[PDB]
Paper text:
Most eukaryotic messenger RNAs (mRNAs) are processed at their 3′ end by the cleavage and polyadenylation specificity factor (CPF/CPSF). The nuclease module contains the endonuclease Ysh1, the pseudo-nuclease Cft2, and the multidomain protein Mpe1 (orthologs of human CPSF73, CPSF100, and RBBP6, respectively).
We obtained a map of the complex at an overall resolution of 2.7 Å. In this map, we identified an additional density, which is not present in the previous maps of the yeast polymerase module or mPSF (Casañal et al., 2017; Zhang et al., 2020), that extends from the top of Pfs2 toward Yth1 and Cft1 (orange). Given the resolution of the map, we could de novo build an atomic model into a part of the additional density, including a region of Mpe1 downstream of the zinc knuckle (residues 207–222 and 240–268). We will refer to the region of Mpe1 that is ordered in our maps as the pre-mRNA-sensing region (PSR). Mpe1 then continues as a helix (residues 253–268) that makes additional contacts with the side of the Pfs2 beta-propeller. Two aromatic residues from this helix (W257 and Y260) insert into a hydrophobic pocket of Pfs2 that is lined by W149, I161, and F206. The density near the zinc finger 2 of Yth1 corresponds to the nucleotides A1 and A2 of the PAS of CYC1 (A1A2G3A4A5), as well as one additional upstream nucleotide (U−1). Surprisingly, in addition to the interactions between RNA and Yth1, A2 is contacted directly by P215 of Mpe1 through a CH-π interaction (Levitt and Perutz, 1988).
Residue numbers in the entry:
A (entry chain A): 1 to 147, 193 to 351, 357 to 441, 496 to 772, 777 to 1237, 1241 to 1294, 1305 to 1357
B (entry chain B): 2 to 94
C (entry chain D): 28 to 415, 419 to 422
D (entry chain F): 207 to 223, 240 to 268
The structure:
Amino acid sequence: MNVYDDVLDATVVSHSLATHFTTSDYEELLVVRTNILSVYRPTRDGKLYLTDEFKFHGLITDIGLIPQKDSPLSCLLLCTGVAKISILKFNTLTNSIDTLSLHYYEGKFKGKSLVELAKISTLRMDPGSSCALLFNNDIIAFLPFHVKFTAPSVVLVASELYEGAKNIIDIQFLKNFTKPTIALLYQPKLVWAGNTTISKLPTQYVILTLNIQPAESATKIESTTIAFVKELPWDLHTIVPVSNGAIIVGTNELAFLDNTGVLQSTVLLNSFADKELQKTKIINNSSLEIMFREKNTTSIWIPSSKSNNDETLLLMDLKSNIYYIQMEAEGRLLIKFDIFKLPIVNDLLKENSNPKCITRLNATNSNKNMDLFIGFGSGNALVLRLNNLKSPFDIELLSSLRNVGPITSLTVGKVSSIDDVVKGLPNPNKNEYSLVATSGNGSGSHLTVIQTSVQPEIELALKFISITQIWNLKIKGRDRYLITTDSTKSRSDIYESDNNFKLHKGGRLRRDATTVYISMFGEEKRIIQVTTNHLYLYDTHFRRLTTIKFDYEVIHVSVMDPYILVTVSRGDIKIFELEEKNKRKLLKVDLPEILNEMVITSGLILKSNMCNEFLIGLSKSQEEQLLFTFVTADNQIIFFTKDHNDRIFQLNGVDQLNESLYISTYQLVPDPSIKQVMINKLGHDNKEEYLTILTFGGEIYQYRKLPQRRSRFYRNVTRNDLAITGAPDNAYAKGVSSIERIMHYFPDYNGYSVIFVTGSVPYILIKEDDSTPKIFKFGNIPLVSVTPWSERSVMCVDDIKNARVYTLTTDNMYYGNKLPLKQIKISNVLDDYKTLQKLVYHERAQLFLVSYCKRVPYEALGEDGEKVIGYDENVPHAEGFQSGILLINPKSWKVIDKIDFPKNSVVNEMRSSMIQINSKTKRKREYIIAGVANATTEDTPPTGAFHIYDVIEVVPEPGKPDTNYKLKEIFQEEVSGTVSTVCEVSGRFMISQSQKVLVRDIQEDNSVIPVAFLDIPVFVTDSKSFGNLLIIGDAMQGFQFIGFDAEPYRMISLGRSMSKFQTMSLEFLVNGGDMYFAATDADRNVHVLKYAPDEPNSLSGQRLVHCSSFTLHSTNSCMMLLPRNEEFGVPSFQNVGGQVDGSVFKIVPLSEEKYRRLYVIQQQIIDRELQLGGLNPRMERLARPMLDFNVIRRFCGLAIDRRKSIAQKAGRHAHFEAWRDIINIEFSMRSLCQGK
Amino acid sequence: SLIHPDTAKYPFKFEPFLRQEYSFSLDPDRPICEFYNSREGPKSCPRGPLCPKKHVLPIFQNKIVCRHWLRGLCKKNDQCEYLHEYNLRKMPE
Amino acid sequence: TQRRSVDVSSPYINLYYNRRHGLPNLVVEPETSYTIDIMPPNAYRGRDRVINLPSKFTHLSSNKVKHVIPAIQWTPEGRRLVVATYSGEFSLWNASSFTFETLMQAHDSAVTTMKYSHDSDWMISGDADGMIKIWQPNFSMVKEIDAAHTESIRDMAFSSNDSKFVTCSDDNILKIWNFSNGKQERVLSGHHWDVKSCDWHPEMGLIASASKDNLVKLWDPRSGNCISSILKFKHTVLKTRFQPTKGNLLMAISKDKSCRVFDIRYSMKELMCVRDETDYMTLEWHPINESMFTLACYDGSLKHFDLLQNLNEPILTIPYAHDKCITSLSYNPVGHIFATAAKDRTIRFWTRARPIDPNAYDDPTYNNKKINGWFFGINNDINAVREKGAAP
Amino acid sequence: RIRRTTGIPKKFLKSIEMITDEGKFVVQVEDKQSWEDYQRKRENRQ
RNA sequence: UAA
Ligand SMILES: [Zn+2]
Ligand SMILES: [Zn+2]
């Protein structure tokens, strides 16, 4: 009974393509991160503007492009999981992706494989667009394409194409062939470093022309051996086809084989190359020590631009070094084959490592200038501009896609709210905790603060006495006359904001009644104030010029430059227009006749070009017309122009909140749900028109206007990018009960056009240029009124009459990825700490501790000091480890203390555990326990150490007040066996040694003695404790469940997992009175197991019951236990897990009834709704199931009637309770908003 | 506390089972039983196996750590006459 | 004292650091400093399975009393190797250091077979008198079946859930036992003459039996009737095994000098038919890498095979692996140590090859140059690679 | 031809009154207590 | 108090 949700979406870019997918007006950049396909429009200056994002239910293994007849757009080949192809097309009519066909190959692959399949299949596409092949391990799946869209597929072993093909290394389609010719790189006899002396030149290379004969039933393929090469170096791993041949990339060599099939030349890259073994052709010897040690080398082959002889190939190793390879062939023969390292003067590529894909953005018919998009596994994905590809080269950074790299550690601490007072007033996000993760893998490695809410910069704070709403007036582009009103007392003050908000006390403004609205008017020459029952027009000096009396009190009033819209309690509309000549007239505006015979819940004056098609002589993609927009009680959005004749338009489908909206004439059951709407521009640099809908239940719906065909608004339902803020059917009434939610638009917050939603829990709508708009929690205090302030600032008033000016922090913040992300650079230009890991937070001292891990060259030493025999000194060495501990003060994010561990030492685990230092008095102290494992070879005996640190307050060094804490080592000990994990149990700490776990306790005199002992099968991967219950992960045999006792110290073996898997992380999923465990596999599976001693076949609980398996889309690096926030309802907990792709997930345990309801809803969505890539979400996670909250979120995005019909499937009141527990899951992470 | 959630005294449904089997509980530092006697047997305690106190097995009254238990090769299990607890001062050198 | 230790703890540290950081397992280069980049055997699949080849002779062990060793068995976690002797004794040997001496005296007659439970909680051992003993992991005999078979027990294999286990003897029948009560369940009738070995399918209910009547039979444990017969062996069929992990394959050796691998998913389809001039005596599938197995011959000559590399010849032959006929093979469950026992009364341990090794594939196990004590320097060496094979 | 009680801890040996330790002959007996506990633990909720 |  669990539900899985993605706290963060993936950030590591794995694939990229340039094509015409959604439009042919420009070449888009398709970006795949883990399961999200992002379509970007690359600008001329390298900025990436997101067009639309699609989220899939499986891991996108590979992407490919195939053209289609009678269409300029190209279809998309999507590879998901293991051996699955879904052909994707973009439906321009529906602005969505519809799957052309599914192709399952895993079953055939297993049928034709003696050994287990590889986790990732590899897709190759014919340059002639005639066929595509997918191969896993010597089994090739061919997907022919007709020239009725896809011919039947044929799956065969590589031995059927060519007799000798036995261990395929790589397959590629060769170029300049009239038939779909492929090249196979294979090793009939497998050879590695320890096998080279007894096996010479094992790699082979064959060129096969394929004669695909599609038929109605099956496809027949015949391969003719064009050429065959028998003697090749063992380390060749990547085929890089070129115009006249193919470059074979190896760990130590670069072999060039032409399409004729003769190895014309080869380049030795390092000292490990096959020196004096090839000895049959041109041997370009290079002492550059270039190492392509990866399984597959990333590269881009740019064809010759028409031919200018400018065909370029760029290799790129794991350390982000771009290598230029030139092939100055005059024909079949090759001349001047060499590899050149591109000089990088400004080390802009230092922060990035493990490149994944390279794509050229803008062609410009010349290979001299190239704009390259490169995705990285650790650093930000970059858009680089290469200027002069020479054998003066210049490289500049145009833009970047934020990448939280591999989240290798997750902890909770205070990043904000350290100080309870900010500029006199209390901290707006006081007592708010945040997830802090470790990001990156090398020189560029930082702390990523996964903020639960937006932290605004305060530049002004003041206390008011009694207000309910405020307005700030800008007359000469400057702040004057900050009007405040008190609805309870019917008062209105002036508060001239030029000088310390002093009481102006001047002008005939109505001080003795509640102001409903006041703003500048008449091109900043008039001030209009709408009171409870009167409308007043003033000038800059607040002199009365016009007065209008309203019979009924006004409710909603909106103002544009020449017009004002007023709604009164009777429900009828009143629109006034200021006279242009000398103002002070306020003429009436004739409403449409049909308008007065229908109820309007809210209205506003709107400026947009959406209905320009229906207007007379206005069918231009410009000139936003003035529209008087109104929300009817039937939730219908209607609008008309000033010269409306009698025509009223309407957004169709908004009453049911349909996926697609469109403008049409409004021709004519009061169920008012839509509370406020507004259409405005959102974005940072390019502004996109969005329709934002506020419902009476507090939920916010966003519709994107299509830039082409502007009369239509579309909402992405597959993408779960918009956070849930409320529930329709009066569920979660506390979200809107205290403070009424008002949506305020600010075109310039810090250069961002944002939307502010007031209430007890405020929200801000921020849209990055490379991302969709996101709903972000704003602060941790209620917001009552927000007004623009100066330029690029706002003033916000909370519920306790405290007003403070805010500005959006944009220095290291990324307002995308479903949650605000703060980049904390720990390494500076002086001290370059390498990859940071094992980040902990010391609660008592309010400090963060992290461990750096510098990769140093490894020297293999024996047990005696003497070195191991086979050492070579004048040769590149494998990287060892060297680690230490950094004490970081979150006040300044500076390292205030550092301690270093010796060579060949990696801190495999660090904790901030509470340790019982006295068994009698039960005194507990928070110690930092670091588990150091000596990362060395298999032959040397395993060794390690554990250090216990106490954070002590010291006298700060003058100049730096934050250096008032230091690390004091109260105990350390070198122990036999690697210390792979550290965990605290019941006030005592347990560390893992080689096939051993020892429990020790600390006395008052800082004496540490082991008290318990338990044997471990192979290797401890993770260990967690729940009071006195242990779970110890094993690298081969799953995990086991241990209870710990004291007086008679015992390690009771309560149970263990029945299935043996290589677990990555462990955590407890308590789920009420029962007890479950979460175990992440090396196959990206997370398993839920329960301790069920009362079950029959559990052997008194010794056999853990396997509850569910759930295939995550990336490997899990870490898990943590977090308290769970209960919005309506014994403490409850949740699991938070960091992923390598940069995504954060959570498992929320559910009760039986909640699980039943949500399972029924999820099954209904899967069975009835149309999935994006045709992928069944149930089957994708199964490579009592764990529920995918991404599927359940589609319930929130359905139509109202569709929502009711789906909820009716099981439960009369299932809609209400379903919305309640969906809210509970969505807000389960808000326990960080209330702490200490 | 969000940093160190209170997971010590959690109400578990298998706690009575942990009392019956393994003589275990969720409070490692619970007071010793004033009625239970290891030599007399489980019947000495009036509250029976469901006693909130600690019922020390006779295996833990032994004076010297079992050398075969340390290697995981003790053939006598709880019937051994040597200590099956990782007590360092009680080891035979 | 300083000695040759083979521990996979540090390689696992490196592997999990790579996996938790998204770093790929970097290609090992022919240099000693790259031994740190050699991952634990469980981390290697596909073309990297060649790294998990035991080719470096690492240690040579022997009991105080030179007794014939009918069977050896690693503990299910690979911590220790159980060496059964012809005198009915159990000798343990720690995998960390290949060091232990204290005996157990398990049975009264020669222990012919041992087998641990898949749950790793129960070991059953059979002897030459037909007695079957059930052992706890701490080696505390808990149950005897005095007359499980009339003749000497030949082979015993547990079911997937370890609730049942099948045994065979010099009698012409196999009988399935209920482990919970130790009571015989049914008799697998057939197999004229004598049945020499048996094995249970790792996943589903399927029994393979090798017999002196030139037959390999497939049984249904639920019913106890033969479901298919293999007629492809021209003499008595010796030890037969399915596979440790998947069981899609089934291998049986016979003393007609032929080893055959069958695809059980395709009506016992023949995959490999490798013949040798010398007699095969035992086999051992690789515990991690499918399609990889080792054959032991009557003249020593460990022969490691690979279904995907060569269907006709071994991918690696260690011709003088043992001085006499090799009786039992046992891969460590972790997969980093390979243990072999022969009639020369010696236990020899094999580890994976090193990136660079002057004596690689030139040990006295590869060239018949075993002069007096040739393993003294290969068993007392603290390091592994060693300078360029011989010893005092 | 006659064995000695090497690893047997003298409590699973009863005097027969084929294997002997020091003089008087004994025989190994199953520890019919660990097997019984296994049986007890095989019971539901026990 | 040993196997
Ligand atoms: Zn008691
Ligand atoms: Zn003992």
